[PDB]
Each structure stands twice: as C-alpha cells, then as structure tokens.
C-alpha cells in the first residue's frame, strides 16, 4: 500500500494550494452539475426556500498528474483541503449548511490526467422574492445563483457539465414541498458586475405553483358559508328583530375574525392580494345584509308577528332573497375566472 | 513557479502580530459595502438583519511584490496568515461570515502592497425603534463600524469612494418598509482606553400603511359605523340594540387583541392604539346611548325619539371629525 502513499506525497510535494491551477497562464474552467436530493419547504413569510443538493464541481489541475496501478484515486475528503478548490458561493444564499455527519460529506477523486471531481452535500437556504398579488393563486420562479467569490471571469469560469437542461437533476420522490408544486426548472448562466470585478454566475430557476387546496378549505369555504348564513336572515319574519340582529352582528364578527387572520403566514405587504379582495367582497355582502334588515325594520309598523291588522312581507326582503344570492354567484364567477 | 516563490518570500519573516507601520503613522483603511439584502426588520426584537459584501482596503508594504504585472487573488486561507484590521460592529447582536461552499472571504494583493480583503457577512444589528407614531412611524437603523483595539494613532477608517462607498440600497425592496435615504458618517469615539475611528451607515425607513388599513383601520371603521344602526331601531327593542351594542364592543376587543399579539410590550401609547381607543369610545358611547334612552322611557317616563334622531347625526359627525384630527396629526 506504500505505492499509493508515495504517489500522494509526490503530488503534494512543492504544491501550493493558494494558487489556482493555471494562474497567470490560462482561465480555470470549472464544470458543475447539481443533483437535487430534496427540494425543501418554501417559506412565504421569509420569502425563502430550502434545497438539498449534491453539488459537483470538476476542473483540471496539471500539478496533480500521476502514474499508478489505478487510473482514479478515490481519496479521503481530507485531501481536498490540501489542494486548491473553487471558492464557489451562492449569491442568493441566506444560511447554508455543508453537512459533516458523521464525516465531511465530501468526495475527491483524482484521475491520472489531472482532472478532479469534487462533490459535497449541501443544504442551501436561498432568497426567493415573491410577488403575492395573485396569492393564493400565484406562481414563483425561485432562483439558485452560484459562482466564485474571489476569482473574476478572467480567472475562473463556470460551465455546466453536460447540457444545461441535463446538468440539474431532481430526485423522483424527493419533494419536501407542502403547499407548492415543482413544475420544472430552467438552467442558465449569466454575468454579474460588482465593485471587485466581473464574475460568472450560474443560475437555476425553480418554477413553483402554489396549491390552492388549503386556502379553499380554511379561508374560501368559511367565507362563503358566512355569506350564505347572513342571507338566511332574509327568510325570517320582519317581527323577529332580535333574531335578525343576531344574524347580522355574528356574521359581521365572523368576517372580521376571518379578515384579520388570513394574512398571518404572509409577509406584511402593502398591496392587496387576491384573497384580500374575496374577503373584502364577502365582508360587503355580510355588511349589506345587516343594513338591509335595518331598512326593513325601519318600515315595520307593528311590533307583533302574524298569529286586527298585521304587517306585510317586506318588498326589500322579497327582492333580497333573490338579489343577494344572485349577485354573490356572479362575483364568484367573475372572481374565479379572473384568477384561475 | 515564479508566483509561488514570490508569495513565499512575502510571507517569510512576516509578523502577523504587528500592523503595517507598527511604530509609525496610522494605517489608513478604506471601506465600502455592497448591501445584498435587508430583511427581518423586527419591532418585537428591535433589530434588523443585513447581508452585505464588506470590503476593506489598506496598504501593507511588507506585501509589496515585483515582477508580476498581475493582482494576486489568493486562496482565502491566506487571510489567516496576514494582518487584517480588527474591525467590528458595535450594535451587532449576531453575525456570521457565510461558509458555503468555503468561507465567503477574498484576499487580493497588488504589486505596491495594497490588500483588498472582502467578507460576505449577515449581521443582525440592534435598532431601537420609537413606536409612538406606529404604524405611521419613520425609523432610523444604523450600522456602527469601529476598530476594536487600534486607536486613531494606529488606524484610520474612511469610506472608500465617499458617498458612493455603499451600493445596493436602491435595489432593496422591503415588504413593510421603504428606504428614504442612507448616510455615511465618519467620526471618532472616545472610550476609557482611547479614541477610536468609527464609520456609520444609517438608513431611514418609512413604514407602509397599506397593510394596516386592511388589517386594523378598516375593520374598526366599519364596526364603528355598524354600531350606529341601533339608532334606527325602536327604543323598545332592547334585545336587538343591546346585542348590537355589545357585539360591537366585543369586536373592537378582538381587533386589538390580534394587533397586540404581533407587537412588543411597549409602555406608551402608539398611534394605532389611539385610534382603537377612539373607535372603542364611540362604540361604547353608542351602547350607553341606548341605556340613556331606556332609562328615560322606562325609569323616568312613569323625548325618547328625539335622542335617537339626534344621535343619527352626532355620532357620524363626531366620528368623521375624529378621523379628521387623527389623520392630520399623523399623516
């Protein structure tokens, strides 16, 4: 086994890991691919998402050529710290983890020609600026940008290993998404100009579509049932002032409870979302059903109900039994067609 | 190989414990910041989180090299072998340098000896916010940059590029705040251990009112309006007018309770508190108005309709007048 020990000692003899390969001679070309083991949950409140990847980088270092019984050295990852590696970082990363349980989750393989393969297991939290105007029927393109921290494009360039569409692969059953659907991803590469120079940036946009099922169950269905309940009052006799006032005030309190609690998981945006409009309109219908009874009660003459002369069924009530359900159905037709 | 020999000679005999010009004039350090994002502006924790690219420039003559017309961008581990300023943030609470895939740090040398040293830092800096006009308040959050152990006789800070030393503020988009301006201040701070150079980066934040209109102001306005409906109901409908009056009082409590749970326990009255108290008084007085009407007819009868007709004007007029004084004072 001392043959392979002597090969490693020769490689590291007089080797400077402070210098990128080809420094002052050529541009270091780094080929990258990403295997997404899990696309983690998306946090709307923080406008961030989590992704777990195998981040693979490959480049050629002529100082690491060797001859031996094997053509590839599948080495302990501690060998990585003794050689030069790319200083890749994620531009939109917030707080990432390079896993090291039970050992640093890194592999290093050296081919005899001097090509290096260097992969690591990462958990990246990345910024995804969301536009929530169409929430909860919104779609987002969450980016994942990475590149060199220190080396400009005249020094280090990044490329995708295979075709860009094939250089980012997501595992078949690795979705940790709860309320989003990963429709697909687009792979690109660009250039960023900063105060320190011009840098290659490799981008991947993950296209996410929110699932509406949770908000139908917990927001849209309760709102609709509160509107339907508020219109049950129209079918009670006008001499039921306490009963029809309870209908009006409880549904208004219910809509207020729904309204202030529907944005609890969202960032406090200044603009109004699609769900805000639906709740505001449902509030108007519920508010108008209590104003309607006030008008009916104002034209009630006698304080006794039908068992002398008796009150008549209100014309306002007769038309409200039709107009209110009809206009709420029309709103739902326009609302859902506008956003779906 | 020439570069490798050059770097070894630079680091051979180099003393990291000594600053450049250790026994001479102070080393001038130029700083610029590229702000990547501001987030988590919290009134509960009284702090904001800032991600930035923190660049420091200084000339260390021990690192001057000749023969190479290149700027030597070295591996970031060489920073541990060089002298770097002991710069720190005074109001920083929790701060880390990003370390994926490697430590987000850069060292770039120049032939004359100039060192460019960059770090990607996320820091949570304390920002004590005065919330007396909340949610119509303007906050001023600062970042205080200081040398820890070197006084003004050993080190000097300046903003490299003047007023253009900080970039990226125009690209920041806060969901709840708008940045009005940012300033760069250079000054000295004296402690018991000496005078120290300080650089200040302050932002002025204006809170967006749109969220609070839908969340607290509009439900309070509509509930206050709804309590006037009792003025149009007959005096003898005690069950209906008490149910309406008490429900509007209960509704105002729910609005305040939800708002209270999202805020730090501050000892003074905020602007939004003043509005909910105003709306509560109007809702409370409408309920007390019926009790006055009920007492006059039943406890004193042995004009009832005048009081209700009078209230149909005064309550809408006084509440609109209250909104006039409130919004003129705070907007």
């Amino acid at each position, epitope marked *: 086994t001392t043959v392979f020990t002597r090969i490693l000692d020769r490689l590291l003899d007089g080797y400077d890991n402070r210098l990128r390969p080809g420094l002052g001679e050529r541009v270091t070309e780094v080929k990258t691919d990403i295997f997404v083991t899990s696309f983690g949950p998306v946090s709307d409140h923080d406008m961030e998402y989590t992704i777990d990847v195998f981040f693979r980088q490959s480049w050629k270092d002529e100082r690491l050529k060797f001859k031996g019984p094997m053509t590839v050295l599948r080495l302990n990852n501690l060998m990585a710290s003794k050689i030069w590696t790319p200083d890749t970082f994620f531009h939109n990363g917030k707080k990432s983890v390079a896993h090291n349980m039970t050992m640093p989750n890194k592999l290093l393989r050296i081919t005899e020609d001097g090509t290096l393969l260097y992969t690591m297991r990462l958990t990246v939290r990345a910024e995804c600026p969301m536009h929530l105007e169409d929430f909860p029927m919104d779609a*987002h393109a969450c980016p994942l940008k990475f590149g060199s921290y220190a080396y400009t494009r005249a020094e280090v360039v990044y490329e995708w290993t295979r075709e860009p569409a094939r250089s980012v692969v997501v595992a078949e059953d690795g979705s940790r998404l709860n309320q989003y659907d990963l429709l697909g991803q687009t792979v690109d590469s660009g250039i960023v100009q900063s105060s320190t120079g011009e840098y290659v940036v490799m981008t991947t946009h993950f*296209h996410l579509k929110r699932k509406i099922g949770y908000f139908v169950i917990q927001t849209y269905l309760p709102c609709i049932m509160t509107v339907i309940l508020s219109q049950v009052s129209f079918w009670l006799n006008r001499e039921s002032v306490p009963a029809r006032t309870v209908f009006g005030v409880t549904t208004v309190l219910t809509m207020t409870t729904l309204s202030i609690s529907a944005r609890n998981s969202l960032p406090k945006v200044a603009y109004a979302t699609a769900m805000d409009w639906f709740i505001a309109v449902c509030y108007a219908f519920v508010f108008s059903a209590l104003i309607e009874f006030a008008t009916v009660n104002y034209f009630t003459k006698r304080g006794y109900a039908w068992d002398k002369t008796f009150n008549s069924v209100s014309k306002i009530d007769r038309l409200s039994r039709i107009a209110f359900p009809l206009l709420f159905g029309i709103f739902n037709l326009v609302y859902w067609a506008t956003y779906l | 190989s020439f570069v490798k020999e050059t770097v070894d000679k630079l680091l051979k005999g180099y003393d990291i414990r000594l600053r450049p010009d250790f026994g001479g004039p102070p080393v001038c350090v130029g700083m610029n910041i590229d702000i990547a994002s501001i987030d988590m502006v919290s009134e509960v924790n009284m702090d904001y989180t800032l991600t930035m690219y923190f660049q420091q420039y200084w000339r260390d003559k021990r690192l001057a090299y000749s023969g190479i017309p290149l700027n030597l961008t070295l591996d970031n581990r060489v920073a541990d072998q060089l002298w770097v300023p002991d710069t720190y943030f005074l109001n920083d609470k929790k701060s880390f340098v990003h370390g994926v895939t490697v430590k987000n740090r850069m060292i770039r040398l120049h032939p004359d000896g100039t060192v460019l040293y960059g770090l990607r830092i996320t820091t949570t800096a304390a920002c004590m916010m005065d919330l007396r006009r909340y949610p119509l308040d303007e906050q001023n959050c600062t970042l205080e940059i200081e040398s820890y152990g070197y006084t003004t006789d050993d080190i000097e800070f300046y903003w490299r590029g003047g007023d253009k030393a900080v970039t990226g503020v125009e690209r920041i988009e806060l969901p709840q705040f708008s940045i009005v301006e940012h300033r760069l201040v250079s000054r000295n701070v004296v402690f018991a251990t000496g005078a120290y150079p300080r650089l200040s980066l302050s932002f002025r934040l204006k809170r967006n009112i749109g969220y609070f209109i839908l969340q607290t102001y509009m439900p309070s306005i509509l509930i206050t309006i709804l309590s006037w409906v009792s003025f149009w109901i007959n005096y003898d409908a005690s069950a209906a007018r008490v149910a309406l009056g008490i429900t509007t009082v209960l509704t105002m409590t729910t609005i305040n309770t939800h708002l209270r749970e999202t805020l730090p326990k501050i000892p003074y009255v905020k602007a939004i508190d003043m509005y909910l108290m105003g709306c509560f008084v109007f809702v409370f007085l409408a309920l007390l108005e019926y009790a006055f009407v009920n007492y006059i007819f039943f406890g004193r009868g042995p004009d009832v309709n005048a009081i209700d007709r009078w209230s149909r004007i005064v309550f809408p007029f006084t509440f609109s007048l209250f909104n006039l004084v409130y919004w003129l004072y705070y907007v």
Partner: nanobody, 123 residues
Framework: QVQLQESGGGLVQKYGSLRVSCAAS????????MAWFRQAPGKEREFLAA???????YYGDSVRGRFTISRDYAKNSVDLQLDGLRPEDTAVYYC?????????????????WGQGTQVTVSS
C-alpha cells in the same frame, strides 16, 4: 397604469454606437426582471438581454459581447447599449418586464411590454 417607453433608435451608420433606454412608470420594477427583445420583420421575437434584481446580466448568443444591458434601479429604468451594429440587427426593439416564470428568455414570461423602438442600420 403601467407603461414602458423606449427611447433612442432611428437610423445608425454601420458600426455605429446606439444606446436604447426604457422608462417605466405605474409600478416599481425593482424585484422584476427588465429585458430587451427585438423583432425582425417576418420573424419571431428574439431574446436579447435581461437583468434581474441582483444585477445579473443574461444575453442571447447572437448579441453576447456586443450589446450591454444596464439598469438604473433608482430611476426604474433599463438601458441597452448597442455596439458593433450590423444591418442584420435592424428590427423593432422592445422593452419588457416580468417575473421570469418558466424562463426569463421566453417572451411569454413578461407581462409588461413597451410599444417598441425602430432601430435601422443602413449599409
């Protein structure tokens, strides 16, 4: 209402330098991707350049290294510098802004479009 107004253009001599600027109003596009497209006569819209909130520049292959895209986030504007102009570059240049859903190079991802500036190169 949201409006995007291109400026510059007209006629330019071969090899001339032209700067095309776009002014946006009615909505702040700080978090959006502001792009440039061109449409040769009898041809589909061709992606030229884009620049997102992080100042990352994307380019089409035919214009990479020739055209430069910059943004004035304070002025809510995007500019496209045209250099090495050739008669093949004569088209209608469009300013666009969008969230880049299903790709920032596809024209269907941009919701806001300018009217269009005619750029012509005479040889």
């Amino acid at each position: 209402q949201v409006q995007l107004q291109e400026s510059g253009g007209g006629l330019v001599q071969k090899y001339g330098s032209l700067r095309v600027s776009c002014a946006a109003s009615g909505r702040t596009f700080t978090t959006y991707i502001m792009a440039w497209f061109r449409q040769a006569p009898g041809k589909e819209r061709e992606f030229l350049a884009a620049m997102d909130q992080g100042r990352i520049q994307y380019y089409g292959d035919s214009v990479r290294g020739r055209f430069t895209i910059s943004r004035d986030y304070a002025k809510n504007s995007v500019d496209l510098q045209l250099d090495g102009l050739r008669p093949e570059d004569t088209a209608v240049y469009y300013c666009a802004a969008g969230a880049g859903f299903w790709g920032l190079r596809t024209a269907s991802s941009y919701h806001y479009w300018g009217q269009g500036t005619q750029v012509t190169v005479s040889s």
